[PDB]
Design an enzyme around this catalytic site. Structure first.
Site, PDB file in Angstrom:
ATOM      1  N   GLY A 174       4.943   4.031   5.460  1.00  0.00           N
ATOM      2  CA  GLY A 174       4.236   2.821   5.819  1.00  0.00           C
ATOM      3  C   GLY A 174       4.805   2.105   7.025  1.00  0.00           C
ATOM      4  O   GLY A 174       5.424   2.718   7.901  1.00  0.00           O
ATOM      5  N   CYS A 195      -6.366  -6.603   5.656  1.00  0.00           N
ATOM      6  CA  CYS A 195      -7.434  -6.197   6.564  1.00  0.00           C
ATOM      7  C   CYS A 195      -8.808  -6.773   6.187  1.00  0.00           C
ATOM      8  O   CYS A 195      -9.815  -6.489   6.840  1.00  0.00           O
ATOM      9  CB  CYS A 195      -7.462  -4.668   6.667  1.00  0.00           C
ATOM     10  SG  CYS A 195      -6.282  -3.952   5.484  1.00  0.00           S
ATOM     11  N   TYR A 254      -5.605  -0.907  22.993  1.00  0.00           N
ATOM     12  CA  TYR A 254      -6.509  -0.034  22.255  1.00  0.00           C
ATOM     13  C   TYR A 254      -7.685   0.474  23.075  1.00  0.00           C
ATOM     14  O   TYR A 254      -8.147   1.591  22.829  1.00  0.00           O
ATOM     15  CB  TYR A 254      -7.056  -0.750  21.009  1.00  0.00           C
ATOM     16  CG  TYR A 254      -5.988  -1.329  20.111  1.00  0.00           C
ATOM     17  CD1 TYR A 254      -5.083  -0.505  19.457  1.00  0.00           C
ATOM     18  CD2 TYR A 254      -5.893  -2.699  19.907  1.00  0.00           C
ATOM     19  CE1 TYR A 254      -4.105  -1.029  18.633  1.00  0.00           C
ATOM     20  CE2 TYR A 254      -4.920  -3.233  19.082  1.00  0.00           C
ATOM     21  CZ  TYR A 254      -4.029  -2.393  18.447  1.00  0.00           C
ATOM     22  OH  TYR A 254      -3.056  -2.913  17.626  1.00  0.00           O
ATOM     23  N   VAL A 285      15.107  -7.545  -2.965  1.00  0.00           N
ATOM     24  CA  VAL A 285      16.210  -6.604  -2.796  1.00  0.00           C
ATOM     25  C   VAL A 285      17.162  -7.170  -1.745  1.00  0.00           C
ATOM     26  O   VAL A 285      16.838  -7.205  -0.554  1.00  0.00           O
ATOM     27  CB  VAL A 285      15.704  -5.213  -2.400  1.00  0.00           C
ATOM     28  CG1 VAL A 285      16.852  -4.360  -1.890  1.00  0.00           C
ATOM     29  CG2 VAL A 285      15.023  -4.543  -3.584  1.00  0.00           C
ATOM     30  N   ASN A 305      18.933   9.931   5.533  1.00  0.00           N
ATOM     31  CA  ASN A 305      19.593  10.035   4.239  1.00  0.00           C
ATOM     32  C   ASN A 305      18.704  10.837   3.299  1.00  0.00           C
ATOM     33  O   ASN A 305      17.582  10.400   3.007  1.00  0.00           O
ATOM     34  CB  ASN A 305      19.863   8.656   3.660  1.00  0.00           C
ATOM     35  CG  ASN A 305      20.688   8.708   2.388  1.00  0.00           C
ATOM     36  OD1 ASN A 305      20.160   8.937   1.300  1.00  0.00           O
ATOM     37  ND2 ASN A 305      21.991   8.487   2.519  1.00  0.00           N
ATOM     38  N   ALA A 324      10.821   7.127   3.439  1.00  0.00           N
ATOM     39  CA  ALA A 324      10.227   6.015   4.167  1.00  0.00           C
ATOM     40  C   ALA A 324       8.740   6.272   4.345  1.00  0.00           C
ATOM     41  O   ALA A 324       8.340   7.366   4.753  1.00  0.00           O
ATOM     42  CB  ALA A 324      10.899   5.819   5.531  1.00  0.00           C
ATOM     43  N   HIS A 377       0.833  -1.194   0.000  1.00  0.00           N
ATOM     44  CA  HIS A 377       0.000   0.000   0.000  1.00  0.00           C
ATOM     45  C   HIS A 377       0.872   1.249   0.000  1.00  0.00           C
ATOM     46  O   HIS A 377       0.658   2.165  -0.801  1.00  0.00           O
ATOM     47  CB  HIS A 377      -0.939   0.003   1.207  1.00  0.00           C
ATOM     48  CG  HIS A 377      -1.760  -1.242   1.336  1.00  0.00           C
ATOM     49  ND1 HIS A 377      -2.651  -1.650   0.366  1.00  0.00           N
ATOM     50  CD2 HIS A 377      -1.830  -2.167   2.322  1.00  0.00           C
ATOM     51  CE1 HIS A 377      -3.231  -2.773   0.748  1.00  0.00           C
ATOM     52  NE2 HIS A 377      -2.750  -3.108   1.933  1.00  0.00           N
ATOM     53  N   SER A 413       6.323  -4.450   6.985  1.00  0.00           N
ATOM     54  CA  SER A 413       6.597  -5.174   8.219  1.00  0.00           C
ATOM     55  C   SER A 413       6.430  -6.672   7.997  1.00  0.00           C
ATOM     56  O   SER A 413       6.019  -7.129   6.924  1.00  0.00           O
ATOM     57  CB  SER A 413       5.674  -4.713   9.355  1.00  0.00           C
ATOM     58  OG  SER A 413       4.313  -4.924   9.020  1.00  0.00           O
TER      59      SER A 413
HETATM   60  N1  LIG Z   1      -9.059  -2.834  13.055  1.00  0.00           N
HETATM   61  C1  LIG Z   1      -7.792  -2.422  13.093  1.00  0.00           C
HETATM   62  O1  LIG Z   1      -7.520  -1.262  13.345  1.00  0.00           O
HETATM   63  C2  LIG Z   1      -6.674  -3.387  12.825  1.00  0.00           C
HETATM   64  C3  LIG Z   1      -5.359  -2.945  12.938  1.00  0.00           C
HETATM   65  N2  LIG Z   1      -4.322  -3.757  12.706  1.00  0.00           N
HETATM   66  C4  LIG Z   1      -2.957  -3.241  12.850  1.00  0.00           C
HETATM   67  O2  LIG Z   1      -1.973  -4.173  12.384  1.00  0.00           O
HETATM   68  C5  LIG Z   1      -0.861  -4.244  13.283  1.00  0.00           C
HETATM   69  C6  LIG Z   1      -0.639  -5.680  13.735  1.00  0.00           C
HETATM   70  O3  LIG Z   1      -1.702  -6.002  14.624  1.00  0.00           O
HETATM   71  P1  LIG Z   1      -1.501  -6.992  15.872  1.00  0.00           P
HETATM   72  O4  LIG Z   1      -0.951  -8.306  15.373  1.00  0.00           O
HETATM   73  O5  LIG Z   1      -2.766  -6.961  16.696  1.00  0.00           O
HETATM   74  O6  LIG Z   1      -0.364  -6.222  16.702  1.00  0.00           O
HETATM   75  P2  LIG Z   1      -0.743  -5.521  18.095  1.00  0.00           P
HETATM   76  O7  LIG Z   1       0.529  -5.034  18.745  1.00  0.00           O
HETATM   77  O8  LIG Z   1      -1.887  -4.568  17.843  1.00  0.00           O
HETATM   78  O9  LIG Z   1      -1.308  -6.766  18.937  1.00  0.00           O
HETATM   79  C7  LIG Z   1      -0.426  -7.747  19.467  1.00  0.00           C
HETATM   80  C8  LIG Z   1      -0.839  -8.049  20.899  1.00  0.00           C
HETATM   81  O10 LIG Z   1      -0.379  -9.347  21.264  1.00  0.00           O
HETATM   82  C9  LIG Z   1       0.226  -9.334  22.558  1.00  0.00           C
HETATM   83  N3  LIG Z   1       1.506 -10.082  22.453  1.00  0.00           N
HETATM   84  C10 LIG Z   1       2.654  -9.655  21.887  1.00  0.00           C
HETATM   85  N4  LIG Z   1       3.614 -10.615  21.965  1.00  0.00           N
HETATM   86  C11 LIG Z   1       3.077 -11.683  22.585  1.00  0.00           C
HETATM   87  C12 LIG Z   1       3.534 -13.034  22.989  1.00  0.00           C
HETATM   88  N5  LIG Z   1       4.799 -13.454  22.742  1.00  0.00           N
HETATM   89  N6  LIG Z   1       2.645 -13.836  23.616  1.00  0.00           N
HETATM   90  C13 LIG Z   1       1.383 -13.445  23.876  1.00  0.00           C
HETATM   91  N7  LIG Z   1       0.910 -12.233  23.533  1.00  0.00           N
HETATM   92  C14 LIG Z   1       1.690 -11.325  22.903  1.00  0.00           C
HETATM   93  C15 LIG Z   1       0.391  -7.876  22.979  1.00  0.00           C
HETATM   94  O11 LIG Z   1      -0.267  -7.625  24.215  1.00  0.00           O
HETATM   95  P3  LIG Z   1       0.490  -6.913  25.441  1.00  0.00           P
HETATM   96  O12 LIG Z   1       0.954  -5.589  24.883  1.00  0.00           O
HETATM   97  O13 LIG Z   1      -0.595  -6.808  26.487  1.00  0.00           O
HETATM   98  O14 LIG Z   1       1.607  -7.865  25.790  1.00  0.00           O
HETATM   99  C16 LIG Z   1      -0.258  -7.049  21.888  1.00  0.00           C
HETATM  100  O15 LIG Z   1      -1.288  -6.205  22.413  1.00  0.00           O
HETATM  101  C17 LIG Z   1      -1.184  -3.361  14.479  1.00  0.00           C
HETATM  102  O16 LIG Z   1      -0.374  -2.184  14.470  1.00  0.00           O
HETATM  103  C18 LIG Z   1      -2.648  -3.002  14.319  1.00  0.00           C
HETATM  104  O17 LIG Z   1      -2.905  -1.645  14.688  1.00  0.00           O
HETATM  105  C19 LIG Z   1      -4.513  -5.035  12.363  1.00  0.00           C
HETATM  106  C20 LIG Z   1      -5.782  -5.586  12.225  1.00  0.00           C
HETATM  107  C21 LIG Z   1      -6.991  -4.812  12.436  1.00  0.00           C
END
Ligand SMILES: NC(=O)C1=CN([C@@H]2O[C@H](COP(=O)(O)OP(=O)(O)OC[C@H]3O[C@@H](n4cnc5c(N)ncnc54)[C@H](OP(=O)(O)O)[C@@H]3O)[C@@H](O)[C@H]2O)C=CC1
Ligand SMILES: Cc1cc2nc3c(=O)[nH]c(=O)nc-3n(C[C@H](O)[C@H](O)[C@H](O)COP(=O)(O)OP(=O)(O)OC[C@H]3O[C@@H](n4cnc5c(N)ncnc54)[C@H](O)[C@@H]3O)c2cc1C
Ligand SMILES: NC(=O)C1=CN([C@@H]2O[C@H](COP(=O)(O)OP(=O)(O)OC[C@H]3O[C@@H](n4cnc5c(N)ncnc54)[C@H](OP(=O)(O)O)[C@@H]3O)[C@@H](O)[C@H]2O)C=CC1
Ligand SMILES: NC(=O)C1=CN([C@@H]2O[C@H](COP(=O)(O)OP(=O)(O)OC[C@H]3O[C@@H](n4cnc5c(N)ncnc54)[C@H](OP(=O)(O)O)[C@@H]3O)[C@@H](O)[C@H]2O)C=CC1
Ligand SMILES: NC(=O)C1=CN([C@@H]2O[C@H](COP(=O)(O)OP(=O)(O)OC[C@H]3O[C@@H](n4cnc5c(N)ncnc54)[C@H](OP(=O)(O)O)[C@@H]3O)[C@@H](O)[C@H]2O)C=CC1
Ligand SMILES: [Cl-]
Ligand SMILES: [Cl-]
Lengths: 449, 450, 448, 448
Positions: free
Chosen positions: B279, B43, B187, B80, B272, B277, B11, B114
């Site tokens: 996304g 999504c 959130y 790359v 640079n 950059a 994107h 990512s």
């Molecule tokens: N509707 C929307 O707005 C959506 C947004 N997204 C975006 O995509 C990106 C990826 O989403 P997502 O995968 O949810 O990433 P997030 O960081 O949003 O969620 C990951 C969650 O998993 C927990 N976690 C992390 N590592 C571990 C582990 N080793 N074991 C157990 N739990 C763990 C964390 O909780 P804690 O911090 O409590 O440890 C964290 O809150 C995000 O930035 C999100 O904003 C994605 C889908 C829908």
């Protein structure tokens, strides 16, 4: 401190509660020609259309409630006169014609408005109803039982609502007004054309560009003669605007050409101890930054509040208004805020607009809906001058987002890229408001080459 | 003359591609993408998984044929391998024949995005543990679902929630595990997440929180997951523990955050001057805190992707920052938020307080009406609005964007309390539910003064 | 044969010459209130703006002319009553109040129209002026050399042209109209915005979307009050429209709701022995095939001829009209014909529209001018419903070509390809009318 | 689908764009001897008279743009043969003389025309020049500088334009014409008398009713000898007429005696897989409803669009033409449409005409201009056959109003009364076209 309130529907109610919460050592006496308060005439049409099962639920307060905090509430009282010099009011109890005159330390003019009634012979006919208060409502319910053919005079919000309501309930509906198109005051042609095709698809008769001349009530009903034709209905309802109920203060306080009380930014009229709020005052209109008369229940609750905050001294400034408004017609949500393109150029303002139509969320969802959008903006400063949204998907909340942009003097560039959530359940990667503003940029980019 | 090479294309790259072309037509743009697809709405996976997407091809809003149709030197299936910011070149190996090539550039766009977070855990390369991000993972999850009655989602973000909800309604027996204490705690606050959990429990979803996964053990019965608090067996596990910037190609060469996310100026340009950059590979300015942060959202990519175009040659349009506005739909309930949560602002030691309001979004005398639970986060001294959220089965999602504009414009709780907002019984009370929300804040501030 | 003609301005002047030449044996008597005839009211604004050297040129016929042809001319005569069933008319000699009653075989009602007047407070002022005939013109011509402030009431053809004439001759011009756009009935919003801006460029103050509550004689002038403002002027000219001057037969022949005499294709009223032409009768609006009230001089001269031809037996039929019209305003030629899109959408007609701007001739020429064009059409039958053109170049004639298109029920496809000359001095290879219709074809195919 | 287009000036350019749009699938190949396209040969006279400023504006298209649209643009190519039965075309590259052969499914024959070249002694002189090409105009630009004496050979449109152009820029202009009156083909003597006299006003020697025997080359100038006189000149330009450039199909499809490719209502030849548009084809002449040859740019642009429209199957029909034309001679505008009275009298048609002069707008306006008008019609059906107008005022658009009248077969009775706007800035109460038709009405009743 002795405080008196003239009129009490919405502006007076909020002011009352607010003044007693801010200054409990006050003696607040309110007068109201009517018996009730805080009636939501905004919900009358819903009531007639069958959308209201309990009418008393249209009152969010009562004379008892106000008088439980210390309000000297005199219902059935008609304030007959106020002298800003001797600081007294002359009121007459409507139950026995008892006149009295009391002094005051501060006076709040919340007398609101009254429907506009032209000088048309046959007006005196009883088959010509007004629509404003709970008394007009209760009259319409019954008199709409044996009135199969109903006609609405005017082309504003009320006329649109009344027509639709009476149309989805088995009536031979006719709508008449001098306006060239329905609700011209709020939306541009692209919007009002879709509503008319609706009104026509639902059998409603549209007689626009025509102005009534008389009312000859026959034994066959009420005969209306406009300057282009004549129609035979069973009941006519006046829906051709409001005029401020400001007779008592005429010539006594600075007013607009219609009688609307000019005020500063704290709701004080030219009389430093006389306040106004609601359908009796003129609101600061941000899109033009000049006073204007926009009777809306939104201005009555806000202005009524500031009065209480500023009764004793200036405390909180009025934020003006964008005149945000909207309604539902045949399952379409229709909302707008700020200037229409027609209303902006009619004032000679430097204005352009864009009409965009895009689905509100991605087409791959189980369903989606088209949303017709309009953005009025300054082509030079890029300042947003207003907008509108129409869709069977409730887009009403977006109008309040545009209202915020206008309040904050935001541009199409701001709205084009301002952060907004994304989720296929709700919108595309760019919210339809971003896309709308990006069309304004694309429009201005076309003119920059 | 001007040679631009785009690294990545989902994107942030697509918009930047379409932007540069229309902005700088006398340019030769080449883009490399490991995949064979571009602009995949990931999504929409859960919606596809959940069975609400019948035509999966409608999940792409572009295609290499389109970009090349406009003049992009499109090169799919290329990885790359390295980038030299000195001699301004890149080395890429064609994935169809392992053919390497070092090419030069005048400008580089680092839209590599990512990749999920894969922890050093035992039993990890077990195929029963899968990922979810691109079109390849979704296609497999479509196959791995037909024969996976039990499914476990690992994490507690929006995805883990969206996936758990999606599978539960499609007949699967789903379980949720995460170190977090409350579903989607990063959130929303407790009043919101407790209702979400109640829905899950009400729908048979097994919630196992506070537990740290420690091992997966393949078994002809399925997969066995070991958590310090218990052991579960599911047929499938999905890693949903966040993203990490896919930037290691530029490590030690451009200023990155602790997680390798690229830092940019107000115009998306890294340290640079010729490397932009946009996304998931960069950090965005977070207006609620006015610091850089990692908010990987498709909203930022498209915006930053555009800004790279208008600015690729010189500063033209400044970035507006972001409030992290986001929201989902779980069990016929609209949940949205923007800005800081109370816990997240407190956890940062900011002067913050909050009101939690619950009212019907429109008057009861209407034939129907729905309660809307609202939360406002604000500074108790400056009265500046720091964040907020809404939850309702009435689609209140648009109100989150309204809050976003207040934060963007540094509005206060007094502004929101009295800002003009339409009234019609079909939509709200005489005061919009957002005015009411802000007026409870003032009420909260009107007491502690007395 | 006895022939009675009421009023003789334009329609009456033509039916008389036609009748006396068609049947040079009948007895023709014409009564006219005024003292002159054949005065083109359409020349009032051009003089007032200082463009007519000798105003004697605004008259094209005269009583002596008509009496020489064989008619009996009775100027300064009010017709006080018409008796159809008795076939008599009673008139008063305005010179000595003497009344007489004469019999007629045929009667020609060319009583025309009279400016609309509002039931208002202050309308009787001597600062409130009308503008229809020779008397009104001299009054406005005399009381205009001192009046610095002038206010036009109305947004129509007359109002727009009075504002332009006065404005171009050092006047404080204020145009107060209740309609939100000047000349809403003739041009869709796109054309008028340029026109309204043209007025602002020239200092005219536009009070559009307002209704005058009253006129009040103030100290320093006459105060005009509306619903949103109040205005100070030295002279207020009423340009609110016209009403048929047909009270003489109200209830004696079929009339439209506004009093316009309903006729047939031969100009015969509901009473056969009574003919009507001009501003007293309605007209068949070819675009809709309904009867409209289109009080234009073009209809008066045409119907007057038809009265004189169908006076005995239906001889020649009336073709109707597309209400072709146009004017010159601040260097611009603005012409229209048929329906606009708003009126079409207003009257429940299936209609769409294309707008096109283009230099009427090639840019390599020593000069050229953009032309703003509009074409209203039925999107499913393709038939042309109306059109308009605007440009500093004289495009007036192109409005006549459109009328012939509407007269023959042509379609956008007919206009898109019909033979039109080409020479760089005049147009492009395709005439801008061809180009205008071709753009309509694209829009039709775009939504298919 | 394979499509080969021969010649690409105007009709070719349009047929190309119409094909590429409506069929982005077929394969388009185009051949042009010249190195350019879209050049408007109607501007040469303006550019020769120094009225143009950048001749790069006389080009509205180009090979690049056409190739950018999906066509194979083979410039500087001279197709040497067409083989319908084989459905192939033998072309030759002019840059290296190479030769290939290509198959086609449909071939668009837009070879245009070529100036009629007269068999004459001296016709080889380099002082004798043509005037149809972009290259031709360049050689005319260079020559004129050192050419004080320019001779025009012809009596039609091109000669009259060039004569006026060179006469207004200080040249000794002589016009030699076998025809007895310049432009006998578009205007009756009533109009040409004013034009011929105009030329005698401006020092142009007319040699009408003469035929050149030879060009005698000399040192002080090329002397021109006719059956009646002799003339020395520095430059003689040929403009006797156009001939169809359609030898590639001589004997392969039906043709007019002059070679014009006979097409049907959809532009298709006797071979169904070959289209013809422009100077290569004859057009249905509405006034006579016969096939005639009128090489007009207006004919080519319309027909080209019709090829791409009906390329696969008859979709749109050719509406015929009135051969509407016009030019700007000195300070007058002369337009025509349809048949002259003489041309109708020479083809055995019931035809009469009227001639009416009249100030185009009321004399009380600041200024007006006479307008000489001609209307040809059938005196017993009243059907209009043709018309012409001449005046200092730009009456160009009125020639298009008449074509629509002819197109719809209207009569003098329709034009005499059909609606037309009135405004003193533009016309009298009755438009001068209405007045013209009304004049025709009076002549039939004068002999009924
Ligand atoms: N509707 C929307 O707005 C959506 C947004 N997204 C975006 O995509 C990106 C990826 O989403 P997502 O995968 O949810 O990433 P997030 O960081 O949003 O969620 C990951 C969650 O998993 C927990 N976690 C992390 N590592 C571990 C582990 N080793 N074991 C157990 N739990 C763990 C964390 O909780 P804690 O911090 O409590 O440890 C964290 O809150 C995000 O930035 C999100 O904003 C994605 C889908 C829908
Ligand atoms: C300022 C103005 C400008 C205009 N400009 C244009 C234009 O540019 N182009 C265009 O096409 N049209 C124009 N018009 C419209 C045009 O002038 C009228 O449509 C035209 O005058 C109508 O002709 P008429 O003879 O049928 O009616 P009228 O001209 O109105 O004459 C009616 C006559 O009837 C007489 N009469 C009425 N009752 C009696 C009675 N009892 N006894 C005796 N006499 C009586 C009256 O004295 C009057 O003279 C303009 C009109 C006005 C006021
Ligand atoms: N949903 C909402 O928010 C609603 C809000 N309201 C508010 O309440 C107030 C009163 O409502 P309403 O009565 O609709 O007033 P509005 O101003 O909304 O509508 C009045 C309309 O009647 C027309 N009109 C005025 N005079 C005449 C006449 N003599 N003959 C024919 N038509 C005429 C006007 O058209 P023109 O101006 O073109 O002459 C105008 O558009 C409004 O100011 C509005 O703000 C009312 C209903 C619903
Ligand atoms: N060049 C030409 O062809 C000309 C022709 N004429 C003809 O002569 C006749 C008279 O012309 P004219 O005077 O322009 O009449 P028009 O009807 O053309 O113009 C009247 C205008 O005034 C507006 N109006 C009506 N009533 C009021 C009111 N009470 N307050 C404020 N504004 C109001 C109307 O707007 P709305 O209808 O939107 O309410 C209308 O557009 C017309 O029939 C016209 O055809 C006149 C002059 C020039
Ligand atoms: N503005 C416009 O529309 C223009 C159009 N054209 C078109 O281009 C085409 C070519 O133009 P052009 O070549 O000027 O042809 P034109 O028809 O314009 O004029 C040629 C004239 O030359 C006369 N003529 C023919 N042979 C001789 C001869 N041997 N000696 C003397 N005079 C002779 C003919 O008169 P007669 O026939 O009486 O013997 C004929 O009318 C024409 O068909 C025309 O339609 C050209 C220029 C301008
Ligand atoms: Cl917690
Ligand atoms: Cl409009």
């Amino acid at each position: 401190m002795k405080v008196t309130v003239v009129g009490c529907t919405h502006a007076g109610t909020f002011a009352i509660k607010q003044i007693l919460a801010e200054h409990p050592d006050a003696e607040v006496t309110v007068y109201e020609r009517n018996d009730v308060i805080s009636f939501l005439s905004c919900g009358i049409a819903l009531y007639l259309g069958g959308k209201v099962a309990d009418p008393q639920g249209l009152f969010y307060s009562s004379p008892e409630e106000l008088q439980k905090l210390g309000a000297n509430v005199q219902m059935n009282h008609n304030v007959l006169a106020i002298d800003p010099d001797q600081k007294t009011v002359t009121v007459e109890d409507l139950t026995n014609h008892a006149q009295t005159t009391e002094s005051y330390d501060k006076l709040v003019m919340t007398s609101g408005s009254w429907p506009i009634v032209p000088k048309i012979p046959g007006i005196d006919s009883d088959r010509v109803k007004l629509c404003k208060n709970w008394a007009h409502a209760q009259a319409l319910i019954e008199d709409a039982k044996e009135a199969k053919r109903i006609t609405v005079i005017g082309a504003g919000y009320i006329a649109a609502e009344l027509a639709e309501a009476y149309s989805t309930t088995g009536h031979d509906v006719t709508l008449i007004a001098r306006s060239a198109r329905v609700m011209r005051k709020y939306f541009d042609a692209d919007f009002t054309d879709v509503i008319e095709q609706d009104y026509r698809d639902h059998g409603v008769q549209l007689a626009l560009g025509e102005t009534v001349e008389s009312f000859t009530d026959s034994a066959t009903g009420l005969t209306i003669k406009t300057d282009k034709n004549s129609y035979e209905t069973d009941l006519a309802i006046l829906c051709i605007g409001f005029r401020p109920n400001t007779d008592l203060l005429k010539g006594k306080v600075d007013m607009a050409p219609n009688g609307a009380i000019i005020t500063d930014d704290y709701m004080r009229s030219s009389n430093p101890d006389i306040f106004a709020a609601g359908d009796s005052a003129a609101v600061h209109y941000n899109p033009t930054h000049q006073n204007a008369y926009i009777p809306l229940a939104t201005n009555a609750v806000r202005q009524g509040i500031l009065v209480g905050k500023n009764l004793v001294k200036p405390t909180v400034k009025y934020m003006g208004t964008q005149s945000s408004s909207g309604l539902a017609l045949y399952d379409r949500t229709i909302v707008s805020t700020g200037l229409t393109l027609a209303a902006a150029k009619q004032q000679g303002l430097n204005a352009e607009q864009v009409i965009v139509e895009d689905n509100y969320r991605p087409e791959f969802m189980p369903s989606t809906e088209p949303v017709l959008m309009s953005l009025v903006f300054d082509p030079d400063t890029h300042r947003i001058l207003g907008g509108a949204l129409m869709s069977k998907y409730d887009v009403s909340q977006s109008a309040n987002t545009l209202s915020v942009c206008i309040q904050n003097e935001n541009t199409i560039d701001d709205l084009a890229m301002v952060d907004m959530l994304f989720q296929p359940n709700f919108d595309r990667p760019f919210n339809y408001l971003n896309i709308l503003a990006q069309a304004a940029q694309a429009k201005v980019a076309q003119s920059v080459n």
